[PDB]
Amino acid sequence: GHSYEKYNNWETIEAWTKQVTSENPDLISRTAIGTTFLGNNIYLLKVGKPGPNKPAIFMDCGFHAREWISHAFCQWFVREAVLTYGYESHMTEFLNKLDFYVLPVLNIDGYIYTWTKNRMWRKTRSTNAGTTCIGTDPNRNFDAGWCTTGASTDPCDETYCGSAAESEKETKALADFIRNNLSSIKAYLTIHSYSQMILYPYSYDYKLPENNAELNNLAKAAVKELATLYGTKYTYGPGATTIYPAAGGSDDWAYDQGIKYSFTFELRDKGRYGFILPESQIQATCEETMLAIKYVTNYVLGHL
Template structure:
């Protein structure tokens, strides 16, 4: 087997996380991370893609405390949004490097397990590296039209295929033949269904436009805990502005951008995961999906700050007084 040079070894330096990586390198990184942190990181195969690539979830667990809650983080549902998988790798690296050193991440990881899916759409991601950098969907084939791909973020059973999605298989926002018709969305939905009692927070990472969104996206109606979600998103946006001088809009998806049915965040919310968010990372459009590697660090630091703010708020709202996260 060819030996990897230092530049692709996840342990080489933090600069590894300031570059984009091929699907093969991400799979290598997943295996290497689990190998290097056997007591903390577990790899769970939750399914496979249309083209039979594995869908690996990393479970970060710092202890075996009973009745521990969890959060879910997925990246790369849309193939061309490369900074999204970069954030999942960044988050894992940060969590493993700074657990016990950073008070916020210590509180979160001591009280929550974290499930991370670095690339939800591996076929599409691979295709953006080899053939079409701007590809969005997965790579399933429509028997009726011969067109490729469904939009995985229109394929969940949340007002599926209504206004804001398309039933045309050739469309960028094709909703699929039926809810969870795509193996990728079905694998995620099955995993979340089987862990819905422990998962309290759902985060899905997209780009671009710098927004912190929450349900609903499929209707203009407000969710039951709209004010809680708004308060969390607002605090995260304010801290990003304070620390990084960058502006993030925030609000319910449908009101903040547009109607988008069949999204994973709305579906997770309706499943019972009442703290559900979509992050749209940098930038505001100058580079769009082609965000330069030099901006990965700032994009990921902003998303990391928002994740910590929101996860700590979720702990505060869901834990009993006797099990509140410790402070220093």
């Protein structure tokens, strides 16, 4: 019961990750980088023509449970990658020279919760000591300026930074994988909604990254490319000044690990529907986003 033009529940996404791997065993392999608080496998797909010691780009979706278009996009990306490999020259070059690590849904427990009990949930669903309030904000749970500006120490708050950095099994798993694979990963892309933005470091402080001038030009070019299809307008810049400070983010943590091309995407829209983006907009949203991801990928290959 899977569709690329509808939002799919976790049972369906899980089945899809196995399906797309089985159909394309020579281009895709699947692993589980860990388990969620509730015991669900956290899947990662490795998309590319297999080879020794290839560079890689890492992309995840579904950090935040309610941001359903994010999850939708990782699925769209994988189909497009397989469908156009061997057919379109650029994607064919891409998957020959590098690997894509695609993590379709990080916060699986929260996503299940938005389908069963509360469409507007954001955090994980781990329990907290001493309170009935549930969950930690995964994008405040990484070891980058942890629990300083833009995060809450209150477990009942939506930006609760957690009992400690990487306290959540899900974020521990992601950080672990990246650490173990640091030599290969040239870029980190993390998909959110909404607001139509491309963000880069820093978010935990107002200081600018060493390669600020390069990241700004790249984001500028990427939003230009995105707009070419349907005229969708993105803003861009350092996280802290471009939206608000948010310490403990995975893009900042990836960057300070040495991954110099680290971007957060905020997809459609700009508040008309917000997180409840109509299914009729999924295809158009994913198509234009593909153009930006491919632009950044082509850039990375030329700047290894």
